[PDB]
Amino acid sequence: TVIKMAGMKPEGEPETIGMHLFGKYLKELSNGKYEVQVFPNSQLGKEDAYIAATRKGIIQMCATGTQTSALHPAMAMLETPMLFDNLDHARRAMEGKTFDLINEGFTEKSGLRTLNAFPLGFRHFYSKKPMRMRVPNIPLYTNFAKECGISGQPMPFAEVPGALDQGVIDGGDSPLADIVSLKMYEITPEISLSGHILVIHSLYINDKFFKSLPEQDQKWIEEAAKRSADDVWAMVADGDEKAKATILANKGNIHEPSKELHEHLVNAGKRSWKLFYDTVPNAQAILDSADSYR
Ligand SMILES: O=P(O)(O)OC[C@H](O)CO
Numbered sequence: 001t002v003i004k005m006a007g008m009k010p011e012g013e014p015e016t017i018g019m020h021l022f023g024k025y026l027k028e029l030s031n032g033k034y035e036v037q038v039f040p041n042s043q044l045g046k047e048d049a050y051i052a053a054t055r056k057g058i059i060q061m062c063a064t065g066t067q068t069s070a071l072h073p074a075m076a077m078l079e080t081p082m083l084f085d086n087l088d089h090a091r092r093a094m095e096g097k098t099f100d101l102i103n104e105g106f107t108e109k110s111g112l113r114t115l116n117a118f119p120l121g122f123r124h125f126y127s128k129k130p131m132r133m134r135v136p137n138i139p140l141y142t143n144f145a146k147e148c149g150i151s152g153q154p155m156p157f158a159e160v161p162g163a164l165d166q167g168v169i170d171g172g173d174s175p176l177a178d179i180v181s182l183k184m185y186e187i188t189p190e191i192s193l194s195g196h197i198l199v200i201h202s203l204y205i206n207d208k209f210f211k212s213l214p215e216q217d218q219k220w221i222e223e224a225a226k227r228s229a230d231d232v233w234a235m236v237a238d239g240d241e242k243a244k245a246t247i248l249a250n251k252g253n254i255h256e257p258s259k260e261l262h263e264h265l266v267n268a269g270k271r272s273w274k275l276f277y278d279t280v281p282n283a284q285a286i287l288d289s290a291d292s293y294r
Contacts, residue, residue: 001033005061005203006050007040008157013181014120014239015063015201016040018232022203025224030217036061042158055111057206065120065201066138071110073279074102076140077286078117078200080276082269085294087119090198091233092293094118101286112204115225118232120175121240122195126188127171130255134163134172143275144197147268164188175199176243177236185252192255196265203228 005023009015016038023036044050044059047067054062069076078099084090093099094117107113127133135141137154145152153169157178163169164187171188173196179185203225210218247254257265276283 001035003034003036003061004044004059005036005038005063006042006044006053006059007038007063008042008047008050009063009120009178010041010181013040013177014118014232014236017235018118018201018203018228019063021231022224022228025227026220029220029223034217034220042156046156046158051112051204054204054206057209059206060209061203061205063201063203065199066140068106068110068112068204069138069140071112072106073276074104074282074286075106076138077102077276077280077283079140079197080287080290081140081144081197081272082266083287083290084198087198087233087237089290089294090119090200093290094200096289096293098286098289098293101282101289104282107207111207113207113210115203115205115222116229117200117202118229119236120199120201121177121236123173123175123197123199124179124194125171125173125190125192126179126184127190127192128188129170130190130192130253131171132169134160134169139279140272140275144268144272147271148265149268173197176240176247180243180246185247185250189252190255191247191252192257194257194262194265196269 005019007015007019019038019040023038026034026036047064050062051064051067053059066076066079099117103114131151132153133145133150135145135152135154137156142152142154155163161182164184179191244254
């Protein structure tokens with residue numbers, strides 16, 4: 001049985017590594033019965049298209065992030081700005097009650113089942129000088145850019161390399177995995193560490209397709225998703241260290257916001273939670289659960 005999975009990231013990036021590991025593990029556990037074909041880097045379209053294709057069952061699985069907030073506002077809270085103190089905090093929440101609260105009701109709305117949660121990494125600024133900034137076209141990001149006084153230029157990730165090459169935008173903010181993967185520092189060499197948001201993605205599965213399988217097969221899929229997520233949680237920290245080094249080796253600079261700007265981002269981050277209180281019925285409970293794991 002072939003499972004087609006689409007994603008949005010290049011090879012060597014944690015989402016994509018995750019996808020392959022899931023594939024490797026699932027073949028293992030199911031004894032060669034299931035094979036997974038991985039289509040990363042928007043090969044089967046960008047997020048809106050491949051999410052829709054997965055909802056329809058045209059493909060069985062997809063890897064993405066808070067893009068699915070379009071279908072279920074609470075999903076945005078997977079990337080609540082300023083919510084987690086570090087990766088370990090976020091992992092406790094994401095393997096615990098916080099994820100459960102966020103995911104309640106999602107499948108009913110979407111036709112998708114969220115199988116795991118794993119990080120791509122904290123977002124840091126990249127720019128030509130230490131401003132037309134790229135932002136993802138997702139509400140939580142356009143809102144947050146505003147609160148930061150940033151002039152946001154919404155565009156899908158797939159368009160980022162051309163946008164950089166084209167030379168009108170001055171920067172953006174991304175996980176280090178993405179900054180290094182796209183060699184952003186060659187064009188926008190100045191990175192400022194902020195970590196205002198931790199990017200969290202998931203492997204999603206067409207729910208109809210999933211529930212059509214034997215309870216045993218469902219278990220192997222679930223175990224493969226868990227193992228794969230566990231691997232990614234364990235590799236991002238080490239990778240960000242090497243990424244930071246790499247930037248500093250290759251004419252890149254790393255900066256430290258100033259007290260004054262750090263404060264400006266935190267407040268911006270806290271203000272941006274109105275978006276969730278406005279849009280997510282159980283926002284306070286979700287926030288409370290995350291705080292319980294601190
Ligand atoms: O990946 P980006 O840079 O488009 O940011 C959007 C995140 O993937 C949302 O989870």
